Design a protein around this ligand. Structure first.
Ligand SMILES: CC(=O)N[C@H]1CN2CC[C@H](O)[C@@H]2[C@@H](O)[C@@H]1O[C@@H]1O[C@H](CO)[C@H](O)[C@H](O)[C@H]1O
Length: 633
């Protein structure tokens, strides 16, 4: 017999360690590790030790680690032993570590994490978590210092038209933090409240309270949440109920997506929205979008913009001049609020009489004029937002292929359509992936979460480390899976009730029930009415992106779809996903039921709910209908 037995190494440092004991991987990788003598073992008595100032970081890591290791790891102040993880903020190490970098020293004095800022120290702790939650509690001795090559690292998250649940955003923010991603462009609607703007309070929207909560979580994780209100195109969710601000073509037909930038009341309406967001986002940036204004058409069909150009910016001025002038005017406005402006690159056009202010950050997603190289020569600040880092729930041409980017040597300097610029260009801020809903019924938000996993590790690695220490994608994939998700995601209670048979009074107007609940692989439920044999669906009402956004829409009974299959069954996606429901536990113990796609909540209608959609149609009082949560607290 073999005698196989656990090594069961004593806690703390040991001068003795095997030469090739595995150093557990991280993402981002920490390159240039210098090996030392021996190894350090987390074990019973290991504490996380820090100053009072770092006490919250220390307590949160001790908790975390207690949960991952099954050892009781307490936080403390005072002296550290060789048994301990130490957290140190040393601001004098800015030159070495920057605002975000960190140093690990593993050895006889234990596991030391050193940062020059609170966020650096926090970031060090993400590597410590990663390293110790792979089933190994012994780490080889040595030292490494690491900092991100690029200043902006993260994602565009389009929480736009459709709602991405605040619980999803929270999980996403923890995922980002674990990967040392510090940037999220959140295109979204903050519920408008002013008399002048409140008719745009259609769903999706987020409350002021919702936003202040996820922003404060973001800032604790080192993440800049930058809002976007795209303009002057892609404005349907703002101008639908304000036709007075929509741009008409030459024949008088209005487009709810197009802002009439020759109308000063319209410009002012946009500026009013900037002012509403200013109260709840802490960032120093404003993103005005400026992408795809004329998609589906041309400036030749909007002669009003030419006339406006010429009046406004003198004879010779073109519609492109008016467009840029609108951008410059929004620039001037946000700068007076202390902000820097950001846009998409496809706005930037050939202008005769006006030129785009150079103090506007250009996020470059589309190979169409200027090319990246030309924007470099004229001195623009650039972020790489290449389409090669796009996911879309419906557009299958937009699926990040991380294997391919890894194996083909893509870097942050590889702009859209393989246009390589100097990756050390001094105004290259970094790079991001982009998460787009488009036609939204094809994939649930929890399916988006599973899918983006890999691409998020890829962009973390290349924006921080800009290296390929794994020989192939497949090696990186093996390690990123061993690393796995941060604790908050592992703890999220996706399906808080067991499958089974339930009485649900809230649903009495549809059926006396009872209801058979079964779970789905993406963390939702199907609800079968045992009376009719049919299943509850949120299927009918007015939609954006092919999803029912109508406030007060009623669910219905439909033939049961197969909710057990994956997102590659595109042909049945709508019947399937309109039959998914998210159940959540209250603080404490009461359950809400939300349609998985819409993320409104089922409630009994009172008739006192106030929303613009309800002015035009209200479900019968006392029936069960979907409503944003803020209307039913
Ligand atoms: C900046 C950008 O990429 N603009 C649109 C084009 N791309 C190409 C692939 C994606 O489908 C993406 C579109 O989703 C982008 O538009 C955004 O669409 C959302 C809804 O999906 C909102 O309407 C935004 O305002 C658009 O910018």
């Amino acid at each position: 017999s073999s005698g196989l037995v656990p090594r069961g190494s004593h806690m703390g440092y040991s001068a003795t360690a095997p030469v090739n004991l595995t150093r557990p991987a991280t993402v981002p990788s920490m390159d240039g590790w210098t090996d030392g003598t021996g190894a350090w073992t987390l074990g019973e008595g290991t504490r996380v030790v820090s100053s009072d100032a770092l006490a919250a970081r220390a307590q949160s890591l001790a908790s975390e680690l207690t949960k991952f290791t099954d050892v009781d790891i307490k936080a403390a102040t005072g002296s550290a032993t060789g048994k301990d993880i130490s957290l140190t903020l040393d601001a004098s190490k800015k030159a070495e570590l920057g605002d975000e970098g960190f140093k690990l020293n593993i050895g006889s004095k234990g596991l030391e994490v050193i940062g020059a800022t609170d966020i650096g120290v926090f970031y060090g702790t993400r590597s410590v978590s990663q390293m110790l939650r792979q089933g190994q509690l012994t780490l080889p001795a040595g030292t490494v210092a690491t900092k991100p090559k690029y200043k902006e690292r993260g994602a565009t998250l389009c929480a736009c038209q459709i709602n991405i649940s605040t619980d999803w955003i929270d999980r996403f923010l923890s995922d980002m933090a674990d990967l040392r991603l510090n940037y999220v462009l959140l295109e979204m609607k903050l519920k408008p409240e002013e008399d002048n703007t409140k008719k745009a309070a259609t769903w999706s929207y987020y409350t002021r309270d919702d936003v202040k909560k996820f922003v404060k979580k973001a800032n604790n994780y080192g993440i800049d949440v930058i809002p976007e209100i795209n303009s002057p195109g892609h404005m349907n969710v703002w101008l639908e109920n304000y036709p007075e601000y929509q741009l008409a073509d030459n024949s008088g037909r209005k487009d709810p997506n197009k802002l009439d930038i020759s109308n000063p009341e319209a410009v002012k309406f946009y500026k009013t929205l900037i002012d509403e967001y200013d109260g709840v986002f802490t960032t120093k940036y404003w993103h005005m979008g400026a992408d795809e204004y004329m998609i589906g058409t041309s400036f030749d069909n909007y002669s009003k913009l030419k006339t406006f150009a010429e009046k406004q910016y003198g004879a010779g001025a073109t519609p492109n001049d008016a467009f840029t002038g609108f951008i410059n005017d929004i620039d001037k406005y946000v700068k007076a609020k202390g902000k820097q402006l950001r846009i998409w690159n496809d706005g930037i056009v050939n202008t005769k009489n006006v030129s785009l202010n150079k103090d506007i950050v250009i996020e470059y997603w589309y190979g169409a004029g200027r090319k990246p190289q030309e924007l470099v020569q004229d001195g623009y600040t650039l972020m790489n937002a290449t389409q090669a880092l796009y996911w879309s729930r419906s557009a299958q041409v937009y699926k990040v292929n991380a294997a391919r980017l890894y194996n083909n040597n893509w870097n942050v300097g590889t702009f859209d359509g393989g246009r390589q610029i100097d990756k050390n260009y001094d105004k290259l801020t970094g790079a991001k992936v982009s998460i787009w809903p488009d036609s939204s019924y094809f994939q649930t938000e929890n399916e988006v979460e599973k899918e983006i996993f890999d691409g998020m590790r890829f962009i973390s690695q290349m924006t921080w480390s800009d290296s390929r220490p794994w020989a192939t994608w497949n090696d990186m994939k093996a390690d990123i899976d061993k690393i796995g998700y941060p604790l908050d995601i592992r703890e999220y209670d996706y399906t808080p009730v067991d499958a089974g048979i339930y009485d649900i009074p809230q649903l009495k107007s549809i059926s006396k029930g009872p209801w058979e609940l079964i779970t789905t692989p993406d963390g939702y439920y199907q609800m079968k009415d045992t009376v009719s044999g049919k299943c509850l669906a949120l299927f009918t009402g007015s939609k954006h992106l092919d999803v029912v956004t109508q406030v007060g829409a009623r669910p219905e009974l439909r033939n049961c779809a197969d909710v057990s299959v994956g997102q590659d069954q595109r042909n049945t996606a709508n019947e399937r996903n309109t039959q998914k429901w998210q159940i959540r536990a209250d603080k404490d113990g009461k359950y809400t039921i939300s349609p998985a796609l819409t993320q409104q909540r089922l409630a009994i209608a009172t008739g006192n709910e106030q929303n613009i959609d309800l002015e035009t149609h209200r479900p019968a009082a006392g029936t069960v209908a979907q409503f944003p949560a803020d209307l039913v607290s």
